[PDB]
Amino acid sequence: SGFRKMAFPSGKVEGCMVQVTCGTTTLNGLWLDDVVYCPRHVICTSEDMLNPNYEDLLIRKSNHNFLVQAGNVQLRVIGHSMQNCVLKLKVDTANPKTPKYKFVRIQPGQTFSVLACYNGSPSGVYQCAMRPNFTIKGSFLNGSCGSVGFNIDYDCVSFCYMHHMELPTGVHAGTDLEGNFYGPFVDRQTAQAAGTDTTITVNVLAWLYAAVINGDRWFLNRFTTTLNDFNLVAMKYNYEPLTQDHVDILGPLSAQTGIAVLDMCASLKELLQNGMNGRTILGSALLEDEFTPFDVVRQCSGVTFQ
């Protein structure tokens, strides 16, 4: 019992983090097999940032202009290429600590763990969600670029995020490991604004199920609703529309608790329309939307990784 925002154990990803320096700039790279992945703006001066021509800037960079350090040892860079907004530095040594891994591009609403790194060294681990507006609400300072977001599937690390930028409102933007930004963001110092930060409705419902599993039941009401009636209220509160796919995904939690998804939707509608009246749910004073239904099952069933 109890329910916490819980990250994956970071051990497997800690062994992949290195420091990448190009002229003036030091940030983090991910060393998998004989390739180091890092944000392509490692090549930019602060001047360059306003309007970079990365292809032009890259012409003036050779293998020896990329300093890659794994703890205290230099890796020899024997190749480089640009794929979208990431650099791939070929090194002459396969990372002996390369875990089983995949590159995945996650969907909005999906959660992952961030290992915040500075100078190739891990500083801390926390859980994030890809927001519907394709931002993340992270904790990133100057030096954190190239830090990665990941999920673990038993022994397989799925890398889904590389950190690139901060936006107004203190939210963050980055790419998958093929270097394609999530959302419309570009790696340039220009006026960019996120979009409406809508709530992940299916994740709020998953978290309400987690509360009932943990004996926190005060918000269950005597009402039911329809998808269409719920979505009419959802839209007003900037909630994502709930689909039958979402209902289906909550099936196991509904089964566990004996509360129909539509009954829980009616409970959520009353919390949206009436607020919490100074009460809390799993020690939160607002409706938490960074737990997926899988996240709740994992934590409430104690699924493990190795």
Ligand X SMILES: *[C@](O)(C(=O)NC)[C@H](C[C@@H]1CCNC1=O)NC(=O)[C@H](CC1CC1)n1cccc(NC(=O)Cc2ccccc2)c1=O
Under 8 Å CB-to-CB from 270, ≥6 apart: which residues? 219, 221, 223
Residue 121 β-bridge partners = 118
Q: Specify the 3-state DSSP secondary structure of 300.
A: helix
The region of 29-37, 165-173, 253-261, 292-300 touching ligand X under the rule CB under 6 A is 165-173
Binding mask 239-278 for Cl ion (x = CB under 5 A): ----------------------------------------
Q: Interface with ligand X includes 30 (CB under 6 A)?
A: no
Q: Is the separation of the CB atoms in 236 and 282 below 8 Å? A: no
Cα–Cα distance, 97 to 33 (Å, whole number):
9
Which is nearest to 291 in space by CA: 303, 279, 299, 280?
Answer: 299
Q: Give me the least distance between CB of 33 and ligand X, in Å please.
A: 25
Which of ligand X, Cl ion, none binds 20 (CB below 5-8 Å, type-dependent)?
Answer: none
Q: Is the separation of the CB atoms in 26 and 20 below 8 Å? A: yes
Q: Give me the least distance between CB of 254 and Cl ion, in Å please.
A: 25
Which of these is catalytic: 16, 38, 117, 145? 145
For the record, the structure tokens of 51 come out as: 């309007």
Q: Interface with ligand X includes 206 (CB under 6 A)?
A: no
The region of 16-24, 47-55, 208-216, 285-293 touching Cl ion under the rule CB under 5 A is 285-293
The region of 74-82, 88-96, 163-171, 276-284 touching ligand X under the rule CB under 6 A is 163-171
Q: Any alpha helices (H) in 137-194, and if so which ranges?
A: none
For the record, the structure tokens of 13 come out as: 């990803």
Is 117 tagged catalytic? no
Is 160 tagged catalytic? no
Which of these is catalytic: 16, 41, 44, 163? 41
Interacting residue ranges for Cl ion, rule: CB under 5 A: 284-286
Active site members: 41, 145
